[PDB]
Structure 1
Amino acid sequence: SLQDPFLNALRRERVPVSIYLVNGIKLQGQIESWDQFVILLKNTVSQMVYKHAISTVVPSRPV
């Protein structure tokens, strides 16, 4: 509900994000796509991140 427009705003302007995982690890890249359960984060290769493993998605700059 809030997830969709939040992630869409980031994707359409190709705003880089930091995705902090529940274990502290920080991933970085651009939101390429997503569904109910995963976010596809783009960089060199596209990695599929499970939302359940994410603590916070942080834009690098205001959107």
Structure 2
Amino acid sequence: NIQDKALENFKANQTEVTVFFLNGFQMKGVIEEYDKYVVSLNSQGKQHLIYKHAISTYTVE
């Protein structure tokens, strides 16, 4: 299970991740929480709740 380990890892190290969506949209932020379907991303201070079915790629720095 690479996913939970990766999300867990980001959440922990408070890594600034770039989330690429399927429609070409994107947000740079920090993964705060997450379950089987969503992912909570703190970006520019505002909280964004994201469905994984919309996410495409998670990229680091």
**TM-score scaled to structure 2, two decimals?**
0.91
Unaligned regions of 5+ residues in structure 2, if any? Answer: none
1:2 and 1:52 map into 2 onto residues whose CA distance is: 17
CA positional deviation for 1:45: 1.1
The secondary structure found in structure 2 opposite 1:41 is: strand
| Structure 2 residue 38 is matched with structure 1 residue 49 | no
Counterpart residue number, 2:7:
7
The secondary structure found in structure 2 opposite 1:31 is: strand
Matches within 5 A, 1:17-36: 17-36=17-36
List structure 1 runs of 4+ shifted beyond 6 angstroms: none
Q: Flag the structure with higher strand content.
A: 2
Q: Name the Cα RMSD after superposition.
A: 0.8
Which AA in structure 1 matches 2:25? I
**TM-score scaled to structure 1, two decimals?**
0.89
